[PDB]
């Protein structure tokens, strides 16, 4: 709203990294503090710092914050294990009359190396053709990184309608897995000849198909 | 002092929905409590801050005169209501604590914080699942293993927690997560390694837990006899 | 009269009881004919085939079982009788033939994609050699442009 935060910011493990929070003169250039929240996606967010000038206790010093007049700036030295969270900017909003949040900036690379996908395409059985439903279910397992696009063809048409994708979790090999599933009816679940599911990964693609008769 | 908070709550679109913000400990009767909201794909925003001490409504002009705050002395906790609900409510929401301090800028802070209440409102309400069990083909066995599951379709809340044979076995077994359906239900699937000489000696049976609507459905795989 | 049999997408006798072609199928098959030395006068049936199969098999599987297919619901312990036909099954090659049946030589060279650096693959191509003119070069050290 009145506050905007950078979506990201690079940086490197060993170099300092900074950002900035930018608003308007009637919330943070107007005279009050502001406050630095860290939003870790799993736990709540707690305190890290106040007023840009006393530490709070269970803090470490690293943190660094100042005030450049209208605008607002964080420091840190050192990418540790535990910067894979989100920084939002708040203070205290004349106009709103309340508190107002940032945008939010994620601190985050990549850092996934390829590996092999593995597909495996599963029809439907005799006792879900009777629930008036046609559920298709194409499950991927062992790929990294998980982020594996998902086709559905009929040999004559792409498939358009019911394409679903889930979100990928880390397995105990430190692997990812995924499902697809896909919404008909055993009205033309029959008449067609061959369903298949097309992925691409890295330029890999591999094609599986069924015979339903 | 900590503050716990009340698990998932799904309600529906013109309901009234009940939370519940608990201390464990003491300074909770002096020192004024807030809510804070956060929400996948926007910013946290601020509805209102009450005083427990004197029991003072303090909202934001962005929000209408439609939710309220009650605050209890006795057993030192606070409730939230909300009615009419919409389709942006999906989010959660934080119980938060206020400290004042003294200086030029004196801003609200929010030193202590809360656990979360995940909110979730669509269509499609809670009703009796369908499992499907699913038998390997002989086309789709190549080496020594074999590859079957459980499906569990068309069902209502999040979370479901499944189990093999009430956890005798736990080698090999994956979870997936569920997705977003566009009439608004959820599908996870849930399949383990199995090898091609204990297909017909022993048997795998999938259980389900719906604890929202208190359901325990027991499915039966069977190999199929044509491939 | 087998040879356009090799193809990804259909069902006979010899591509699904031999070697099935998959649908994810990069393969580069090879044939001709060479009929003057694989065959000879009185009948050469040196070379064999399975006709007889329980069921199907995975692509990219080779089967060397010459266990007896049954076809009837008693065992018969390996013998000629009935219900029972040995799968395996000899050719009828013979020079004399037309075009056909002839004997031909049928190659299959398939490519794998994995998460491997190149080992087999072209190098670079030998391009035309120019002289007396503005060009630009890299002899594995430099990359010089001059005539």
């Known amino acids: 709203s009145v506050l905007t935060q950078p979506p990201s910011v690079s940086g490197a493990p060993g170099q300092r990294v900074t950002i900035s929070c930018t608003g308007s003169?009637?919330?943070?250039?107007?005279?009050?503090?502001v406050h630095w929240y860290q939003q870790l996606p799993g736990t709540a967010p707690k305190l890290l710092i106040y007023?840009?000038?006393n530490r709070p206790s269970g803090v470490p010093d690293r943190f660094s914050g100042s005030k450049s007049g209208t605008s607002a700036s964080l420091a840190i030295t050192g990418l540790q294990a535990e910067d894979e969270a989100d920084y939002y900017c708040q203070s205290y909003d004349s106009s709103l009359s309340g508190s107002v949040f940032g945008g939010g900036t994620k601190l985050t690379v990549l850092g996934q190396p390829k590996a092999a996908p593995s597909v495996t395409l599963f029809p439907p059985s005799s006792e879900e053709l009777q629930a008036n439903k046609a559920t298709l279910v194409c499950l991927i397992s062992d790929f990294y990184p998980g982020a594996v696009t998902v086709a559905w063809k009929a040999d004559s048409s792409p498939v358009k309608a019911g394409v679903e994708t889930t979100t990928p979790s880390k397995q105990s090999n430190n692997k990812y897995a995924a499902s697809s599933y896909l919404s008909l009816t055993p009205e033309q679940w029959k008449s067609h000849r061959s369903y298949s599911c097309q992925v691409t990964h890295e330029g890999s693609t591999v094609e599986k198909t069924v015979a339903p008769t | 002092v900590q503050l716990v908070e009340s698990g998932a709550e799904v309600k529906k679109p013109g309901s009234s929905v009940k939370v519940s913000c608990k201390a464990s400990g003491g300074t909770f009767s002096s020192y004024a409590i807030s809510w804070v909201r956060q929400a996948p794909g926007q910013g946290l925003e601020w509805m209102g801050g009450i005083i427990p001490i004197l029991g003072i409504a303090n909202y934001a002009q962005k929000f209408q005169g439609r939710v309220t705050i009650t605050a209890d002395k006795s057993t030192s906790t606070a409730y939230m209501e909300l009615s009419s609900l919409r389709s942006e409510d999906t989010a959660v929401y934080y119980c938060?604590?206020?400290?004042?301090?003294?200086?030029?800028?004196?801003?609200?802070?929010?030193?202590?914080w809360g656990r979360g209440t995940l909110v979730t409102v669509s269509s499609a309400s809670t009703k009796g699942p369908s499992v499907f069990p699913l038998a390997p083909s002989s086309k789709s066995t190549s080496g020594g293993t074999a590859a079957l599951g459980c499906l569990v379709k068309d069902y209502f809340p999040e979370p479901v927690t499944v189990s093999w044979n009430s956890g005798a076995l736990t080698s090999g077994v994956h979870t997936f997560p569920a997705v977003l359906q566009s009439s608004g239900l959820y599908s996870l699937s849930s399949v383990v390694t199995v090898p091609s000489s204990s297909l017909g000696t022993q048997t795998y049976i999938c259980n389900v837990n719906h604890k929202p609507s208190n359901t325990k459905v027991d499915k039966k795989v069977e190999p199929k006899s044509c491939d | 009269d087998e040879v356009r049999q090799i193809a990804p997408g259909q069902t006979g006798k010899i591509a699904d009881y031999n070697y099935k072609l998959p649908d994810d199928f990069t393969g580069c098959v090879i044939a001709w004919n060479s009929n003057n030395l694989d065959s000879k006068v009185g009948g050469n049936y040196n070379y064999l085939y399975r006709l007889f199969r329980k069921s199907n098999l995975k692509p990219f599987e080779r089967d060397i079982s010459t266990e007896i297919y049954q076809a009837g619901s008693t065992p018969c312990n390996g013998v000629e009788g009935f219900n029972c036909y040995f799968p395996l099954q000899s050719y009828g090659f013979q020079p004399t033939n037309g075009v056909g049946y002839q004997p031909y030589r049928v190659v299959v060279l398939s490519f794998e994609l994995l998460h491997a650096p190149a080992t087999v693959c072209g190098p670079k191509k030998s391009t035309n050699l120019v002289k007396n003119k503005c060009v630009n070069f890299n002899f594995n050290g430099l990359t010089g442009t001059g005539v």
């Open positions: 938060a604590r206020e400290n004042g301090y003294s200086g030029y800028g004196a801003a609200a802070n929010f030193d202590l």
């Open positions: 003169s009637s919330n943070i250039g107007a005279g009050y503090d």
């Open positions: 007023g840009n000038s």
